[PDB]
Write a protein that binds this ligand. Structure first.
Ligand SMILES: [Cu+2]
Ligand SMILES: [Cu+2]
Ligand SMILES: [Cu+2]
Ligand SMILES: [Cu+2]
Ligand SMILES: [Cu+2]
Ligand SMILES: [Cu+2]
Ligand SMILES: [Cu+2]
Ligand SMILES: [Cu+2]
Lengths: 501, 501
């Protein structure tokens, strides 16, 4: 179903502010319900989107630029996706993923609000968010974060891009303009209606199981890029810059080109790497970003398809979800490609270690027999335990006793991945003891940079180092598989300033 | 007991040939029983060694140098280590690990011989081996390979070094002379006698168990380097070249320095890399080699200890086997360090791909209840199945359904590690179908060179690609955990020439 590579790759328009001064740059974005055609042969798709478009408008901000956004809710009173009323209306709150944001503008899950702020969550306090943008140039993105329905609102189309620029990044003569292309890759499933399909219950729903019921994992049979089903793009035989983002609910990608063409990765979630990394395949979990350079100069006239290697459970991808999009190197070379792939990308490096933390990834069963994925076997309602001090540098040991990868995400900060190491699963479930069973392995070279989301392998412990700065207050950390996050792999993160005790 | 860092680090003497001409360089090495003091506070240890020294003499050969060695057996009638007479006297045959050697001089396990060639194995042919040395510069090593008792003869002390030199390697101004130090690392256990300890049976043997009985794994409590228990070495504050080798029976090391000093790996088992790789920790399984450069120039007066992170089952090392040796940067800098750490090492890179092979790692139980580790669930007695054609390129998929790492080693060839990928263990032990459960991962950057031994992770499939050239005939491939190789993880490898039908 759905013929591949018939629609052209859409580029989200750069959002224009309502007012821009030397003090502040003020934006207004509204969440509206609408229809949008996602494939040449599909009927329009009912979606929740920012400024009536999917994906939302793209923010272009600068370092130090004080940006203010008023996120307006104009969505209906009822959701068009199956809402599980038993895990915790259309509630909305906007979170800038990876943004160095004070807690009052970070998009707390319980700071949600309905249309026109008429019904507010218990943590609501502001209608106009402010982003100081005191972080280095990188690729961020914004999406909904309302509690218990984050999997639905994000899947409904509430995602958008957000770029930060530096004088350091611009000093690098990188492919810019039309030669910098963002790839917001997502997976979805459609009815014959053309509308989104999201399961109401697991496969064989028992009678007394709640209806609707949250599923432990969802992944669609159709791959989209920038809101277009298996699109295509006509490029020039030169160097391009791809800002790749995986905004799926669950699906992990393993991207590769069907020709002998290599990705040159120059940046991660947090910003630029120190030197480019020559990689043939990109393993990108949900919410992970990859800043890559691709050279098509030796490929004039060829048809290069961006491919995916793995399915939803890590198996070999079917030659339907094995396709991302198709590049056709047929556009004539306008000007000479004078863009650069410099050997050095940063110069500047990325302490005392004040705190150590052990955090377990697991699951429990509720009264209906559903798996409840948990952080430290602790529900979201429970009191806060991850309480780092303002300015503290900590090493988090993330212990994955599950069957598959968990992409764990921390708010506010950008961390570094230390190493992965396997441990004894049986000893861990019977004793709580962490006995290692193999040598430690550093992260891949293209994951040595600043990141806010890390793939924690199954049966292994992932160590990250993080400096909780420069804002104190209430944040959260969670797994970015939204089906896990909503029930209930999410926990509060309280950064505390110390002054007089 | 055994105080650490009280004996100086021995350097094995280079072996002098008996006769050297334009045609051939002829050597003679004898295996003799002798006693050698391995620690300052240990009585001399009974050993089997080449030329009455442990480790054996070091060969220094050239590329294209036709080297001939006549390995002579002068060993006693009785082996001092416990011999299992149920798995398949002092039988000996010398194998040049990693050498591009014709089969008649490769050291086939059943080409063994007793003292003065009295009794000869069923595959014996010649007394003088010839090594054409038509391969690039690398660090090899020679050790005993007699069938059913390879774990005993190697543990008895029948190991030695063998270096090949190139004009390419020499063109690199690498640290040479006394500033190139080989680190032959091993582990052993000692009786109060000072003699070697090696278990006769597993821990709790039923009376139905044979006596002696092979164990699935042995690792000693004491770490040796170049035949000296926890030695030390006084170095100058400059760059050194370490040719590290793991010659243990089973133990896998994770080497690191207790100071902020980085390994710059320049070569692997098969020879030089293309570019140096900055690594903080070296994971070296048995038979693996690591050519690394260490810069001590900023450590004048410091005491730098080479440490080991992991133990026998991959757990955290005990602060006794966590120590390898101690480097004391106290020798004054003689001459100015003019050696080079060049950014380019090889220039020239490392085909059609004719054959694909799936090879499983597992274990069965014999009549006595002992685990029998097997390749393709097939005994060594059984007919040969790995029959590549001369000059053909193959991709071997090594499927490890076991609990721990298996260092799989192939003879004759040097291969390139493609990737690792997890699979479903439970589905694999039911219908034998291979279902992957995660993304593929390329090898670490410092394991991208030519290799002849690869760490196959548990629950993962390690893909290797090899070209079987230029000698046809009978070789073997096996796991280099000697307790596994002897019972019975060793299978024949037949390279067949084709020319007429
Ligand atoms: Cu996010
Ligand atoms: Cu976030
Ligand atoms: Cu998860
Ligand atoms: Cu979040
Ligand atoms: Cu060997
Ligand atoms: Cu070998
Ligand atoms: Cu093994
Ligand atoms: Cu061998």
């Amino acid at each position: 179903k759905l013929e591949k590579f018939v629609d052209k790759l859409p580029i989200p328009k750069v959002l224009k502010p309502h007012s821009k001064s030397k003090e502040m740059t003020y934006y207004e974005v509204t969440m509206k319900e609408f229809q949008q055609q996602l494939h040449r042969d599909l009927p329009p798709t009912r979606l929740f989107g920012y400024n009536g478009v999917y994906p939302g408008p793209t923010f272009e901000v600068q370092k130090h630029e004080k940006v203010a956004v008023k996120w307006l809710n104009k969505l209906p009173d009822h959701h068009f996706l199956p809402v599980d009323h038993t895990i915790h209306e259309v509630k909305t709150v906007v979170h800038l993923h990876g943004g160095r944001t004070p807690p009052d503008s970070d998009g707390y899950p319980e700071a949600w609000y309905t249309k026109d702020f008429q019904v507010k969550g218990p943590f609501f306090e502001r209608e106009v968010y402010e982003y100081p943008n005191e972080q280095d140039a990188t690729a961020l993105w914004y999406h909904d974060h309302a509690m218990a329905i984050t999997r639905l609102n994000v899947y409904a189309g509430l995602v958008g891009l957000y770029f930060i620029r530096d004088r350091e990044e611009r000093s690098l003569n990188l492919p810019k303009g039309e030669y910098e292309i963002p790839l917001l890759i997502q997976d979805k499933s459609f009815h014959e209606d053309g509308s989104l399909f999201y399961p109401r219950q697991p496969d064989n729903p028992s009678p007394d199981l709640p209806d609707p019921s949250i599923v432990p994992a969802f992944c669609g049979d159709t791959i989209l890029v920038n809101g277009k089903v298996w699109p295509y793009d006509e490029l020039e035989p030169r160097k391009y810059r791809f800002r790749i983002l995986n905004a799926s609910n669950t699906r992990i990608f393993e991207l590769y080109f069907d020709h002998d063409i290599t990705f040159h990765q120059i940046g991660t979630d947090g910003g630029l790497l120190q030197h480019p990394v020559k990689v043939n395949e990109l393993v990108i979990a949900p919410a992970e970003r990859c800043d890559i350079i691709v050279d098509f100069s030796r490929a004039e006239g060829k048809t290069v398809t961006l491919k995916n290697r793995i399915g939803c459970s890590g198996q070999d991808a079917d030659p339907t979800d094995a396709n991302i999009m198709q590049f056709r190197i047929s556009k004539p070379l306008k000007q000479k490609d004078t863009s650069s792939l410099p050997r050095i990308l940063r110069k500047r490096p990325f302490h005392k270690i004040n705190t150590l933390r052990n955090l377990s990834l697991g699951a429990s069963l509720d009264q209906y027999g559903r798996p409840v994925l948990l952080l430290n076997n602790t529900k979201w309602h429970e009191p806060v335990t991850e309480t780092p001090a303002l300015g503290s540098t900590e090493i988090w040991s993330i212990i994955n006793a599950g069957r598959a990868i968990h992409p764990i995400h921390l708010h506010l900060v950008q961390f570094l991945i230390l190493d992965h190491r396997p441990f004894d699963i049986e000893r861990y479930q019977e004793n709580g003891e962490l006995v290692f069973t193999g040598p430690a392995a550093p992260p891949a070279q293209n994951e040595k940079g600043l990141k806010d989301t890390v793939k924690v392998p199954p049966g292994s412990v992932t160590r990250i180092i993080a400096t909780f700065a420069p804002y104190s207050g209430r944040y959260v950390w969670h797994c970015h598989i939204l089906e896990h996050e909503d029930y209930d792999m999410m926990r509060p993160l309280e950064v505390t300033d110390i002054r007089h005790q």
